[PDB]
Amino acid sequence: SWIERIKSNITPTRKASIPEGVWTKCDSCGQVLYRAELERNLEVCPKCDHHMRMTAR
Amino acid sequence: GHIVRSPMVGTFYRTPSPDAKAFIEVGQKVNVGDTLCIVEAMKMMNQIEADKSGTVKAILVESGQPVEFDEPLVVIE
Amino acid sequence: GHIVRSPMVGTFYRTPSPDAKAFIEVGQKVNVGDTLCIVEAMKMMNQIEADKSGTVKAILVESGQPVEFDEPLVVIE
Amino acid sequence: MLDKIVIANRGEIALRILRACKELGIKTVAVHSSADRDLKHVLLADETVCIGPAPSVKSYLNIPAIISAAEITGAVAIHPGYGFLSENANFAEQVERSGFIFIGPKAETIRLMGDKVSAIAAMKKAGVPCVPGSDGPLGDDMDKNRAIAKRIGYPVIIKASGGGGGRGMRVVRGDAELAQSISMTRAEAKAAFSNDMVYMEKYLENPRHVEIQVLADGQGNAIYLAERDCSMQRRHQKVVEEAPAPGITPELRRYIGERCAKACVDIGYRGAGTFEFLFENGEFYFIEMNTRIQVEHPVTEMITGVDLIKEQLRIAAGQPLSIKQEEVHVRGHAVECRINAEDPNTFLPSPGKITRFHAPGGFGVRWESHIYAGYTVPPYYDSMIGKLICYGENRDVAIARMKNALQELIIDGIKTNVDLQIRIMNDENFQHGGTNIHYLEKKLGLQEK
Amino acid sequence: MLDKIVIANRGEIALRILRACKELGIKTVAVHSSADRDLKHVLLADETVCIGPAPSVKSYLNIPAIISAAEITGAVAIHPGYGFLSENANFAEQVERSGFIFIGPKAETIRLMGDKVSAIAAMKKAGVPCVPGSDGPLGDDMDKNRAIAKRIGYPVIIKASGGGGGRGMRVVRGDAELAQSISMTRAEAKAAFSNDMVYMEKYLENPRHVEIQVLADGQGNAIYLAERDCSMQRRHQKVVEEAPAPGITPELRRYIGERCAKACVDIGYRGAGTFEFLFENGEFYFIEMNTRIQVEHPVTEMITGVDLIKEQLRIAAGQPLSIKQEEVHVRGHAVECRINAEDPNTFLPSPGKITRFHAPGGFGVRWESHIYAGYTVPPYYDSMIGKLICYGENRDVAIARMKNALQELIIDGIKTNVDLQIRIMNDENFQHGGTNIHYLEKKLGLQEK
Numbered sequence A: 001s002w003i004e005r006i007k008s009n010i011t012p013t014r015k016a017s018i019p020e021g022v023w024t025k026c027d028s029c030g031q032v033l034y035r036a037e038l039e040r041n042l043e044v045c046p047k048c049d050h051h052m053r054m055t056a057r
Numbered sequence B, C: 001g002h003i004v005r006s007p008m009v010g011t012f013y014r015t016p017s018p019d020a021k022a023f024i025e026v027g028q029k030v031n032v033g034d035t036l037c038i039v040e041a042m043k044m045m046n047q048i049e050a051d052k053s054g055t056v057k058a059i060l061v062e063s064g065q066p067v068e069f070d071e072p073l074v075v076i077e
Numbered sequence D, E: 001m002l003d004k005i006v007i008a009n010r011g012e013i014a015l016r017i018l019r020a021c022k023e024l025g026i027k028t029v030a031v032h033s034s035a036d037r038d039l040k041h042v043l044l045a046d047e048t049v050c051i052g053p054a055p056s057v058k059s060y061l062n063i064p065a066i067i068s069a070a071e072i073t074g075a076v077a078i079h080p081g082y083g084f085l086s087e088n089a090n091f092a093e094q095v096e097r098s099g100f101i102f103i104g105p106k107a108e109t110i111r112l113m114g115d116k117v118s119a120i121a122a123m124k125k126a127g128v129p130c131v132p133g134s135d136g137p138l139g140d141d142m143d144k145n146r147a148i149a150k151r152i153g154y155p156v157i158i159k160a161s162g163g164g165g166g167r168g169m170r171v172v173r174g175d176a177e178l179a180q181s182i183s184m185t186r187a188e189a190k191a192a193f194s195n196d197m198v199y200m201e202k203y204l205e206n207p208r209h210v211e212i213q214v215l216a217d218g219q220g221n222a223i224y225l226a227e228r229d230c231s232m233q234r235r236h237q238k239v240v241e242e243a244p245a246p247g248i249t250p251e252l253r254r255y256i257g258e259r260c261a262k263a264c265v266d267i268g269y270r271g272a273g274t275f276e277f278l279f280e281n282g283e284f285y286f287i288e289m290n291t292r293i294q295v296e297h298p299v300t301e302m303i304t305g306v307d308l309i310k311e312q313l314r315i316a317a318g319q320p321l322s323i324k325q326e327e328v329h330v331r332g333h334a335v336e337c338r339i340n341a342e343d344p345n346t347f348l349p350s351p352g353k354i355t356r357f358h359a360p361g362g363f364g365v366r367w368e369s370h371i372y373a374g375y376t377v378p379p380y381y382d383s384m385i386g387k388l389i390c391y392g393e394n395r396d397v398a399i400a401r402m403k404n405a406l407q408e409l410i411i412d413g414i415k416t417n418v419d420l421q422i423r424i425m426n427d428e429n430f431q432h433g434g435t436n437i438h439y440l441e442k443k444l445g446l447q448e449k
């Protein structure tokens, strides 16, 4: 009866690769962010609107 | 006792680097402020800090084994 | 007490003929051997005989009202 | 249209007929037994009549009580369905004469085609090919019996012309026990079906059960719908039936369909019925006619889009066929899988209560039954409790859905033949499609040490 | 074919997608919330991942957690479904870039067509007729706003271009409250959907909701399947949807379908999406595009015979369209009837436990849901618990079956909108077919003394 299952675990061998420089973090709130989104919102975490560093240029 | 659970989803790593000592290990107790594991997600190797000071009774996961939200990680008695 | 039930299906008639006295009527008790009603089926007007001698407490059906198998007809206390 | 009819049957076919009736706006009357008081179709019906006690003979075969119900409620016809009084030609005669309309063929063809040997003879006369055999009921001329056996070729099988339900058939390996086998087969036929007629028909070792569905209004119109194939059988009882059948090119489809339509015209057939066959090496050998609505009727409905029961109820109302032969189309492929209350292996009925139940649903999956939670299966009749389907645009898709649906399905409280259905579905040859009837019987295997 | 995908959704569409995946042999990954641990589709799935707590924002909209699951399990695509992250163009961008395949349109068209006004502009450019209105987002030039209002003709309606779910729309009776109405509508749009864009579009008083389904592989192929009609609505929320729509002659069908196919080609559309419309006096006025798989997708599947989800999963695997425009056929008529956990009148959600449940089944009746006995409805998301269908060869037959199925259906423990469905089905005008969208709203009535 599928209504009562075993609650099996996931297989570790499965492995997918995400590019390194496409996901950033905001330590102010902890919400992971999409680097291009943050960089397009003038380095402003859209979650908590916490300003961050920006390059002079 | 208490069980601390991963608050996000991602690969489970205990050693911060490919060849590194584990942040914690069975036996040695931890305190409120200390990193217990690494939950990688999108190459951003995050860290987990306990909330109740006590002995590390056991570790319910293994390095390289993906974990889900609220997935129990370690039980503190 | 006991309830005698039609053993077949068919139209329920109490007077054997279109203008006839009822075989039985409330009040007057019956005996084991006596016709209680007529259950017409295919124009073959059959008859029903009680099995337990007792008072006719009531009649649960009415003339012209079809009845089914094991349909309760009269309850004898 | 018929102003009201009586569902002279019980269960899956009863509920299905009830749905068809309510669709066509024809009020319904449910004639139930005392044990089947809380059936689905009973509870969903306008008017419910009890005709007898639990046993079949006392209650559902009590032709007098059924006609009583039909007269008291004012019906103007009756649907027997399949099983109980499906092919009882005398029941048809009585219903015809009593003043009501018998939904199905006229009793005359019931008598002609209910005798297997007369059916085969008329088929030969009408151009339908037939299996080699006696070509007549077996007499006591043992010399002639063995001459015919030698002429057709051993092995041979004895079948009671008045037998039914896949019983009363025995295989004869040689003349050594031919007389005793014939005598005991006749005795069993007498005991069960009260008829002693026995006949000899050739035995085939590599058949592929086929049957072609036909609708005829009895007014010179007879059409043939999609094919079928019930190859999988256990004890000659069908379990899985795929419609159409793999490898039946449209040429053969139309070739045999035209002959079957001509046969229906010749017999003047009325109602829905199916000419069984047997297939091998591109040949057909008539073996019977189930002059009723079969059990695997859906698998023609979902691929043809035509509701058979509605066609029957229209014919009974006197309406001729509203569907031409050309306008009938087979679009795709289907599969069906009966659910039965037997033990998955011992094949012993296990009636009981169903604690928990959950339909499949999902696209293309059709669930016909009456069962539900709290429904105590009565240990008093056939063991079928559902005809499940899975229509696909091809055989692979249909099997896939079946697998998924069977996964979803839960029926708890009584053992059932779901494990076997899953195992058949996973079978490689079955997924290829085209096994011989024996396939399942051979998989059964034999003794092990 | 996609080696594995993640069902980034929950419920009826989640279970349906799971069935489609298992059919096509594509392993499945169920991303659930902590409250939805014992969903059907969750339990029937290969691998289950929990991504957050009960609320929508913490768990199911947690794009990071969904991508986490998709990376850990090794998927190579994701299905969002409809609702949650269906039209979040940024979600599409992230999924595209992260390394996985977004099952649906490319994010670019999500952005272009998720803005209602840009969608209407591109439609005008592509030849699709559009409703009179602002022809641009509303500025603060009250003079121009009132000039446009006078030009199109009162009454008028304010709709947030970034709004969704039939909310954030207000009808303006006159200029007296035009400014305040606009301000509060913008405020509600900001509060809910974070977007302030508002625009003015003419108001129609006698519309007949239409929407034409289209499949395009994004490689220059775009086909149009059968029509639809969601006329019946309560608070602009659909309840009943018939497909095709009464009175849409094949001429209009093909006329609008060719234009919509050309539009899909011009936009280079990829995935399954539906061009809503509005109908009256033989005219069409585009109003939106639901660049996803709608909720009433079945009612095109059963009349066309094509499984839409399978078409999507094939397009995502790079396969072009395997169905030509000519080979698509509409054979019959359908009807659908959502089941929701609201009070039958107050329209207040009533989540709880379902003590007893019984599917309809029967010919032509399709039951899509996940509910079952013991399933405690979570008081945390939308109130839909099943998309029930009844396919007929004509509208009368389909309604009849619906009536019968609704009769059979039992769902106990939580109040539901079955009484209302029965009452709508019995409605004379509805049975005739062709009511205006308001029909149900007008039947509601008004105050009584």
Ligand SMILES: Nc1ncnc2c1ncn2[C@@H]1O[C@H](COP(=O)(O)OP(=O)(O)O)[C@@H](O)[C@H]1O
Residues within 6 Å of the ligand: D131, D157, D163, D164, D165, D166, D167, D201, D202, D203, D204, D205, D207, D209, D233, D236, D276, D278, D287, D288, D437
């Ligand atoms: N002449 C035959 N040769 C081989 N198998 C047969 C023959 N006749 C019947 N059978 C087997 O028995 C099954 C049922 O035969 P049928 O005559 O339809 O009996 P019933 O009336 O019991 O259904 C057939 O489908 C076939 O598998």
Ligand SMILES: Nc1ncnc2c1ncn2[C@@H]1O[C@H](COP(=O)(O)OP(=O)(O)O)[C@@H](O)[C@H]1O
Residues within 6 Å of the ligand: E131, E157, E163, E164, E165, E166, E167, E201, E202, E203, E204, E205, E207, E209, E233, E236, E276, E278, E287, E288, E437
């Ligand atoms: N211009 C309009 N005139 C009349 N009714 C409209 C108009 N625009 C929308 N509606 C009503 O609102 C419903 C939903 O509109 P739609 O733009 O699709 O909003 P949503 O994005 O909330 O579904 C339509 O089916 C229609 O009944």
Ligand SMILES: *C(=O)CCCC[C@@H]1SC[C@@H]2NC(=O)N[C@@H]21
Residues within 6 Å of the ligand: A016, A017, A018, B013, B016, B017, B018, B040, B043
């Ligand atoms: C990127 O290549 C995906 C795999 C994760 C690599 C990192 S290196 C640091 C951690 N140690 C380890 O074994 N794998 C993790």
Ligand SMILES: *C(=O)CCCC[C@@H]1SC[C@@H]2NC(=O)N[C@@H]21
Residues within 6 Å of the ligand: C013, C016, C017, C018, C040, C043
């Ligand atoms: C035949 O005409 C069917 C109706 C039954 C007629 C008989 S006459 C005797 C019974 N009395 C009565 O009122 N009807 C019954």
Ligand SMILES: [Mg+2]
Residues within 6 Å of the ligand: D276, D288, D290
């Ligand atoms: Mg047979």
Ligand SMILES: [Mg+2]
Residues within 6 Å of the ligand: E276, E288, E290
């Ligand atoms: Mg819309």
Ligand SMILES: [Zn+2]
Residues within 6 Å of the ligand: A026, A027, A028, A029, A030, A031, A045, A046, A047, A048, A049, A050
């Ligand atoms: Zn932040």
